[PDB]
Amino acid sequence: ASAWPEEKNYHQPAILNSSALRQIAEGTSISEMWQNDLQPLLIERYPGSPGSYAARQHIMQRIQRLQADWVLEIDTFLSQTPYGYRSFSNIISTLNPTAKRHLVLACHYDSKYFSHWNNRVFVGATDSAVPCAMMLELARALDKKLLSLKPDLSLQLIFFDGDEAFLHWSPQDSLYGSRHLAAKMASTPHPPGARGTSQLHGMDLLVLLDLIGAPNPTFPNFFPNSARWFERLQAIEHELHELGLLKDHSLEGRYFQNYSYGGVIQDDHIPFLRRGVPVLHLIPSPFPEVWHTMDDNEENLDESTIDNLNKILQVFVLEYLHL
Ligand SMILES: [Zn+2]
């Protein structure tokens, strides 16, 4: 009986030196992400809407154009909702599908439903169009390094549909795509042919990005079983800062601070966390001031903060994958 699902407990990063850090800082482009990955998503995209379809095609197209060997799957299913039965479609993009272990980055691509109000439309810029765009920019910026994966460990991206409640949050009206996918992964043997291990056992760590893009975010260290990875984000932020590789950034105003949070924040990691998957929850506390208002738009995003977080996340991912 293999102990491979315990490998994630001892897994250590291969830390980048200064020269490599400067290279990663220079290899991501916030303006290219803005134009090519983010703006096409700043549209109404609640589940089942025309915008949902457009957002899903955009995400698939941007991944498909890359050199790395991404395998795209659309996980479509039905769920009861306050409005009756509806269909939802999660997007999963995976490098090395048969690799036993994957580091998983995720966010939700649906936007919360709101009837148009005084001609304004909710596009959920921080929630979570930016997180989607950060994942797409990370795939683009690290494409040459990721192509080399073509340590039985690789990378997977998940874009959840139906994170938002159709009304106000309730246990049955929220997290449609993640409750469905977590259950599906928990009941799918992995690697193919396995007798007793599932796709969830293969999830080394679920890094969930949510509500990112406002000024001065502070991310709490939520869980003890991922605290050492939260510490790595702190260290990466500190070193990128010291090397002069971040913009409009100070250590007093750092994003990863030393502080936990006792409470529970309901989000797409919950169905995974309750089935034993380690989670690194990159959601700020407090939430952006524009949360769930028509002001959660492009004008209120903080460009340099998103750029700095792209650098930090890309270094974290390369160090985890030893690339
Ligand atoms: Zn929301």
Curated annotation (Swiss-Prot):
<feature type="glycosylation site" description="N-linked (GlcNAc...) asparagine">
    <location>
        <position position="258"/>
    </location>
</feature>
<dbReference type="GO" id="GO:1904813">
    <property type="term" value="C:ficolin-1-rich granule lumen"/>
</dbReference>
<feature type="active site" description="Proton acceptor">
    <location>
        <position position="163"/>
    </location>
</feature>
<keyword id="KW-0862">Zinc</keyword>
<dbReference type="GO" id="GO:1904724">
    <property type="term" value="C:tertiary granule lumen"/>
</dbReference>
<dbReference type="GO" id="GO:0070062">
    <property type="term" value="C:extracellular exosome"/>
</dbReference>
<feature type="binding site">
    <location>
        <position position="127"/>
    </location>
    <ligand>
        <name>Zn(2+)</name>
    </ligand>
</feature>
<dbReference type="GO" id="GO:0008270">
    <property type="term" value="F:zinc ion binding"/>
</dbReference>
<protein>
    <recommendedName>
        <fullName>Glutaminyl-peptide cyclotransferase</fullName>
        <ecNumber>2.3.2.5</ecNumber>
    </recommendedName>
</protein>
<keyword id="KW-0012">Acyltransferase</keyword>
<feature type="active site" description="Proton acceptor">
    <location>
        <position position="210"/>
    </location>
</feature>
<keyword id="KW-0732">Signal</keyword>
<dbReference type="GO" id="GO:0035580">
    <property type="term" value="C:specific granule lumen"/>
</dbReference>
<keyword id="KW-0325">Glycoprotein</keyword>
<dbReference type="GO" id="GO:0036211">
    <property type="term" value="P:protein modification process"/>
</dbReference>
<feature type="binding site">
    <location>
        <position position="164"/>
    </location>
    <ligand>
        <name>Zn(2+)</name>
    </ligand>
</feature>
<keyword id="KW-0808">Transferase</keyword>
<feature type="glycosylation site" description="N-linked (GlcNAc...) asparagine">
    <location>
        <position position="17"/>
    </location>
</feature>
<feature type="disulfide bond">
    <location>
        <begin position="107"/>
        <end position="132"/>
    </location>
</feature>
<dbReference type="GO" id="GO:0017186">
    <property type="term" value="P:peptidyl-pyroglutamic acid biosynthetic process, using glutaminyl-peptide cyclotransferase"/>
</dbReference>
<dbReference type="Pfam" id="PF04389">
    <property type="entry name" value="Peptidase_M28"/>
</dbReference>
<dbReference type="GO" id="GO:0016603">
    <property type="term" value="F:glutaminyl-peptide cyclotransferase activity"/>
</dbReference>
<keyword id="KW-0479">Metal-binding</keyword>
<dbReference type="InterPro" id="IPR037457">
    <property type="entry name" value="M28_QC"/>
</dbReference>
<dbReference type="GO" id="GO:0005576">
    <property type="term" value="C:extracellular region"/>
</dbReference>
<keyword id="KW-1015">Disulfide bond</keyword>
<comment type="similarity">
    <text>Belongs to the glutaminyl-peptide cyclotransferase family.</text>
</comment>
<dbReference type="InterPro" id="IPR007484">
    <property type="entry name" value="Peptidase_M28"/>
</dbReference>
<dbReference type="InterPro" id="IPR040234">
    <property type="entry name" value="QC/QCL"/>
</dbReference>
<keyword id="KW-0964">Secreted</keyword>
<feature type="binding site">
    <location>
        <position position="292"/>
    </location>
    <ligand>
        <name>Zn(2+)</name>
    </ligand>
</feature>
<comment type="function">
    <text>Responsible for the biosynthesis of pyroglutamyl peptides. Has a bias against acidic and tryptophan residues adjacent to the N-terminal glutaminyl residue and a lack of importance of chain length after the second residue. Also catalyzes N-terminal pyroglutamate formation. May be involved in the N-terminal pyroglutamate formation of several amyloid-related plaque-forming peptides.</text>
</comment>
